Amino acid sequence: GKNAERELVSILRGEGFNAVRIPTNPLPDIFATKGNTLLSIECKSTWENKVKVKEHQVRKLLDFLSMFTMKGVPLIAIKFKQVHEWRVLVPEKAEDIIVTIDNSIPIEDLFKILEKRIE
Template sequence: MSSKSKGTKAERELLHLFWAKEWATIRSAGSGSMKYPGPDLIASNKARVLAIECKSTKKNKQYLEEYDIKQLKDFCDIFGAEPWFAVRFSRKDWLFLSIEDIEKTETGYVIDSKVAERRGLLIDELIKT
């Protein structure tokens, strides 16, 4: 399975999780390949709108480029959504992190699995706040 199809599968899995919690959710196909900023998922329950970038990895760290962060921020500023990164490390639960909870490095950003476990929110925690 290609990394693109694995990413699509992860996004769809998360989409179904939000719908199961009664949050209307859409997936933006090709979100990273357009000239306009756009998240992988947009989820809402009338009171809140979440713009979510999804990452799934078998490794203990997920690296992000400055571009990933900027795209999400830019979209949320225009759309009026909350920016979130959803990350799943090797068969564990999805964790949701705000941009402020993601570590800046010299060349970009990194989400460490241990840090994500401390700072990240599970889906039920995210949608109740």
């Protein structure tokens, strides 16, 4: 998963986030900040149209956010290679989630929203 993580970090940095991959278990794949916003990211790349993220993976994203007094947004960021698009889902609670192209949004749509939330 390292190449996809590097690509995502590069995207986030291009978008003005300070983003870093955390070397590899208890921590998110990537975290990124811009202003008072902290993204806690599970990053996945797939040729399938869906990806399963386990409860404990989501929990790790949330626990990481709980460490900081920033406005946290947990994110499952998936490069859905079969549509050549990074899409994201913001987990609302720690549970098993199947992220699909249909229940995710383009990462650029997220960035558009975050631009408003930071503004």
